[PDB]
Design an enzyme around this catalytic site. Sequence first.
Site, PDB file in Angstrom:
ATOM      1  N   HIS A 114      30.868  83.836 -84.044  1.00 30.92           N
ATOM      2  CA  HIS A 114      29.917  84.928 -83.950  1.00 30.92           C
ATOM      3  C   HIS A 114      28.705  84.540 -83.072  1.00 30.92           C
ATOM      4  O   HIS A 114      27.989  85.406 -82.561  1.00 30.92           O
ATOM      5  CB  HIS A 114      29.509  85.486 -85.325  1.00 30.92           C
ATOM      6  CG  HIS A 114      28.635  84.566 -86.106  1.00 30.92           C
ATOM      7  ND1 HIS A 114      29.129  83.725 -87.087  1.00 30.92           N
ATOM      8  CD2 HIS A 114      27.305  84.325 -86.035  1.00 30.92           C
ATOM      9  CE1 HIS A 114      28.139  82.996 -87.574  1.00 30.92           C
ATOM     10  NE2 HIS A 114      27.023  83.340 -86.953  1.00 30.92           N
ATOM     11  N   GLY A 120      20.033  80.777 -88.590  1.00 30.13           N
ATOM     12  CA  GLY A 120      19.795  79.683 -87.680  1.00 30.13           C
ATOM     13  C   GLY A 120      20.759  78.543 -87.984  1.00 30.13           C
ATOM     14  O   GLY A 120      21.007  77.657 -87.131  1.00 30.13           O
ATOM     15  N   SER A 134      23.979  79.000 -88.715  1.00 39.43           N
ATOM     16  CA  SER A 134      25.317  79.376 -88.227  1.00 39.43           C
ATOM     17  C   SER A 134      25.896  78.317 -87.312  1.00 39.43           C
ATOM     18  O   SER A 134      25.187  77.749 -86.464  1.00 39.43           O
ATOM     19  CB  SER A 134      25.256  80.697 -87.459  1.00 39.43           C
ATOM     20  OG  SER A 134      25.440  81.785 -88.320  1.00 39.43           O
TER      21      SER A 134
END
Lengths: 185, 51
Positions: free
Chosen positions: A33, A139, A141
């Site tokens: 993502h 943040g 991820s």
Amino acid sequence: ISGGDAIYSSTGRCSLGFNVRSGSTYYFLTAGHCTDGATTWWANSARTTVLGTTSGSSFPNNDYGIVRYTNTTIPKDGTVGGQDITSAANATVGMAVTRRGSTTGTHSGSVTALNATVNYGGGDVVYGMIRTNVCAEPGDSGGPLYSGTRAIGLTSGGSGNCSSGGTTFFQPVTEALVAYGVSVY
Amino acid sequence: VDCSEYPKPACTXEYRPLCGSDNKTYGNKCNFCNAVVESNGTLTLSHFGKC
């Protein structure tokens, strides 16, 4: 730069998962993502230190992406912070794991379930996810999920937070390594 | 930002901050929208970017 460090695209900030390689070609894994619709990646908010460019992206359904290093001088440590990583492995229920992210730093917990389906909405559904009781926040991820010297997963998403506690889902890293024919070092 | 499709059981994460009327910086839209729901619609968007 190493696993858990901040990475910036044109859109926002994520975390580097693991530094990997294929032959003499170096890349880094992160969340799909984050790689989705991103081309260039930088090591700082100022965008003055280039890292490389997106080489692959798989999201939704899965949640992994890979970026090819174009920066030839930056150190590419095969670690997570100072933690050496020497291999990859499959998650198991009850396994003690640790996550490192660019916003919250390092937090630990355990794997509570496997093959979970997470619906992020708008048709963004990911499958085969590792569920844990480790917290994570925006943040974080793409940051690594590891167990000792073993690479386990990439931070995909979750609920709650590090103050009140939460649930975080990870993409098994083994699947990403195989998809790209890369390996940790 | 429209929070109509909320709440959502989970959010991805990435960091793209929004500033809420509570002066809190929300890490991304999904986080912000889940908080609006939790506030029963009292929280509003102040501006984009960190507070």
